[PDB]
Write a protein that binds this ligand. Sequence first.
Ligand code: OQN
Ligand code: OQN
Ligand code: ZN
Ligand code: ZN
Lengths: 359, 359
Amino acid sequence: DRPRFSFSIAAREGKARTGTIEMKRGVIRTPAFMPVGTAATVGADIILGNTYHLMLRPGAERIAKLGGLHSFMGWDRPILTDSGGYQVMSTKQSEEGVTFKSHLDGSRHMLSPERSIEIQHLLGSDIVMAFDECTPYPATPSRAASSMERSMRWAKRSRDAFDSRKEQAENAALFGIQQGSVFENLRQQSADALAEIGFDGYAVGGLAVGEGQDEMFRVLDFSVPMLPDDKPHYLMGVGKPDDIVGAVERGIDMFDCVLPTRSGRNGQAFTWDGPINIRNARFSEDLKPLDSECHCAVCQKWSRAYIHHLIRAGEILGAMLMTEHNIAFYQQLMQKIRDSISEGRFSQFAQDFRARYFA
Amino acid sequence: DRPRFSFSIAAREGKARTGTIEMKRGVIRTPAFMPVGTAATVGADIILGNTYHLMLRPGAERIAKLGGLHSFMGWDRPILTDSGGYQVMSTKQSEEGVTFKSHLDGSRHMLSPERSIEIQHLLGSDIVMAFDECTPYPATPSRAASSMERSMRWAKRSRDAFDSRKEQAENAALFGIQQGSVFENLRQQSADALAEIGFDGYAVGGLAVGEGQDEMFRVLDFSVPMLPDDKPHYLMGVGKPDDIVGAVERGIDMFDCVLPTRSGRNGQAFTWDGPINIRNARFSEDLKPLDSECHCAVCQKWSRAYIHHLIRAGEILGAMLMTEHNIAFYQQLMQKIRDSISEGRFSQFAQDFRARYFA
Ligand SMILES: CNc1nc2cc3c(=O)[nH]c(N)nc3c(CCc3ccccc3)c2[nH]1
Ligand SMILES: CNc1nc2cc3c(=O)[nH]c(N)nc3c(CCc3ccccc3)c2[nH]1
Ligand SMILES: [Zn+2]
Ligand SMILES: [Zn+2]
């Protein structure tokens, strides 16, 4: 029987790590990419639930009545859920939480650390995020400090709420979220507060909110070493393939991004030679698959020309084939990352990846 | 090696028949439903190409440059194409053909019997439809007669154009299309003209254009017996499951309809208990699959509640799962039809089907 939660590091190269998270519902290979579960018939080891949407439609109590997200979505492996506040802010804030009104039916909703944990419990997720405040970018030092300090109080409330629910405490895991904007001293205080509380994993919050890759990497350079080395590191909201590679070089183990899902519906396909917009007329007679090396089912069977045709014709099949390819590309990227760290050649992989991806 | 075209009738019950069309690319079991090939990753024995759309994007010459529709769409089994005029009328008409302008780029296009056959040749279709005029409904006797007479002249031109192209004549089949609106005497003249020309199969044209099921069936009652018994009978544009059952009772062997494709994107799912609109709130907590007996992959894994959720959330996955189910439902319907004719119990099947479908 697998444990509730165990993270093992099998190999290291610089700050990069590869290993496994064992949970009751499955093993997660790291570095991991975690796709949205509603994106397609989803290989990923864990998928994301969208807490904010699920609160509003059909509601967390209704999901629980239907047997929880695993049964609802037909996915028996781990699920990670966010705590809902980031999405809410993307409103009246107070030390208690956030109040907001639903655009879909006008109903009022409150979100607090306690309610966020209870919603995630009702959804049945395996990895639960603490309820935090994602600080807007840019932030002054004072506002970033005040926000981070509030998040750390909410992290302790999240911990206590999680521990009070026996089924959750015994079967799920709880991640704390570091805040502090781009300021080293605040990132350090945040890390210190989270480690004193104690969590199963640690997320780097407050990034991928408009700062750009150079600044994000600069913050990761000093922020990730502040987190406990022996626990997983999740960079929330990241990202594009080059963002992922650079974040892994800086010690990140887990990733989520809307790019592959959103990109696919808007016509963007990821390839080892960079992204392409398949709607462009230059693909109307291109018989190559979306990517020349990709092993996914789309690239085994259909050409750029056909997928171009489908999307231009407004056919749903075109978007689904694009999304399937993008999700498969990301998983192939993560597998090459894991293999290269385990083989001690990740630095070369990253250099080779960037030379081709940006050519 | 399979023949270019061979239709064999294995069993009969009343006017209903079941059998097989053998073609070089595959065997088609009849009665057959022929789905749109761009609907999903499509079990069907033959799919439809959309001549009218393909003329306009990317163009028939471009499809031929890309290797033909089979290579383009990744489908190595038979493909049927329409002749393009029905779609064009859904314009300046003359004895030569029809002229029309493209909404997508303003280019002018002419469609004649000769050009329609050449386009279908460039597309590489296995079953080629003669170029006809679909008479609007209602039509006066005079207009219906004039239109049918023109269609019969165009049918002879279609035959000659097809026979002039050796690769087409030796590897594809040509169907003639009966017209004559709702008038028995015109349907008879049309049948007589088509049989004197000689075709591989015979379509009943000019129906499913607003007349309603009672009138359609009334026209089929006298029209299908006019066609050669030993060749397949294709009812163009039909239809809903109850339309198909009644048409098979009247001697039809082949079907096409946009319902399963269109219905799926608009929220309509076909079941043995009738159609349902999955977007309806009554399905928000319904844990049953879309249909209780359906063997398709969707109904093996996911609930009405989940598919409801996906469609309401605007997720592409929801429409694709609906479309996959609908196509699978139609193929299960055709298989039950074929089995019941072959077992001599189709009349009972039709009665049982209608009692449950309309309950
Ligand atoms: C696109 N950029 C982006 N930056 C983020 C920062 C934070 C942050 O500081 N705190 C929290 N809690 N979430 C964040 C998220 C949302 C991630 C998510 C949403 C849905 C499902 C699973 C995971 C972010 N996303
Ligand atoms: C929905 N009702 C409907 N009634 C039709 C009547 C005719 C008719 O009298 N003549 C021709 N040639 N086509 C017809 C069609 C289009 C069928 C089609 C389109 C695309 C691909 C494959 C097949 C019809 N469709
Ligand atoms: Zn691919
Ligand atoms: Zn089904």
